[PDB]
Amino acid sequence: RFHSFSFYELKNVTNNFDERPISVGGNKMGEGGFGVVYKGYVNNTTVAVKKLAAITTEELKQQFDQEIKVMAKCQHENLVELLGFSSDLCLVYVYMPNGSLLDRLSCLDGTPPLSWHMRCKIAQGAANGINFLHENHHIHRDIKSANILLDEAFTAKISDFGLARASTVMTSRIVGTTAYMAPEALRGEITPKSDIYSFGVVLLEIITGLPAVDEHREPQLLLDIKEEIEDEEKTIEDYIDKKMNDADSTSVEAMYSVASQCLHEKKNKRPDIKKVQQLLQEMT
Ligand SMILES: CC(C)(O)[C@H](F)CNC(=O)c1cnc(-c2ccc3cc(C#N)cnn23)cc1N[C@]12CC[C@](O)(CC1)CC2
C-alpha cells in the first residue's frame, strides 16, 4: 500500500527542512494552509513532503488520516499520488514538476505563461479528476487553483484531501478558502455542488489569469468581477488574460458559460460534474 517513511530520512533529503527557496539553495517550494512542502530526492524519486503545521494538533492529525484514507481508495491520473507518510505530520507524494495552477497562472518563479490550449486541457483534466471523486462519493471541500497541481506534461492533478468527506449535511467547523467557497459552504453545508461552484471560480482564474482574491486589486474578489460583467457594465473579453496569444473568443465564451452555470448562487441549478465535463469536452 503506502510506505511508512521515517522522519530522519525526510530531514536528510530536505536538508533539514530548509525553508529557503531552491534558487537560494534551500528546499521549500511552497506552503499550504495546513503545512509546508519541500523537494527531496528519495531513491532517485523526486518527492514533495508535506510537513503539516497548525485548528488544534488533533484535527490536523485527523486530516492527515482523511487524506490517507481517501488517497487509498482514489487512484486516478488527474489526482496526486500519495507514496507514503511519516507520522512519528508528513505526507509524501510524487513531486509535481510544474507546481500549482495558481502559481503558473501568475508565472511565479519566472515560468512561462500558460497558453489557451494548455489551459483548456488543464480544465478538462481537473474536471475529469473531480468527476472521479464525485463518482466515488467523495467531496473535496477545497477546490481551488492552488490545489490543482501540474506534472511535467501539465497534466492537472487534484491535491489536498484532508478536508474531504463522504457524499446535504451540516458541520460545526466551516473550513475552506473563502475566496473560492460557495455561499452554502461558507455557512457550514457539505454538498458536492459546492465543489462545482469552486471549480467555476478556477475557470474564471483560468480565463482571466487573475487570482480569486487580490488585496491590492479593485474588485478584490474575482467573483465580484462576474457581476460587473453580468450587469452589462463590461464583457468577459475585457478580462481575458493578456499573457496569451492563442485565445479565440468562441472558446473563451464557452468556458465562461460553464463558469457562469457553475457559479449559480442557488446550488440545485448548478450543473453536476458530468455536465461540466461534457461542456468542457465540447469546447475543444
Ligand atoms: C519547478 C517549479 C515550477 O518551481 C515547480 F513549481 C516545482 N514544484 C513544486 O513547487 C511542487 C511540486 N510538487 C508538489 C506536490 C506534489 C504532490 C503534492 C501534494 C500536496 C498536498 N496535499 C502538495 N503539494 N504536492 C507541490 C509543489 N508546490 C506547491 C507550491 C504552493 C503550494 O501551495 C504548496 C506546494 C501548492 C503547490
Side-chain angles (χ1 to χ4, degrees), residues 83-99:
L83 290 167
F85 49 80
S86 287
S87 42
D88 281 304
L89 167 65
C90 281
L91 282 179
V92 160
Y93 312 82
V94 175
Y95 160 85
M96 283 293 108
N98 273 300

Side-chain angles (χ1 to χ4, degrees), residues 50-68:
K50 194 216 199 136
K51 50 174 276 279
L52 288 178
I55 330 168
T56 195
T57 171
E58 189 272 352
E59 310 169 300
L60 193 69
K61 205 55 171 193
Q62 178 179 64
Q63 305 192 190
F64 169 89
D65 270 88
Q66 201 81 3
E67 187 142 3
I68 289 153

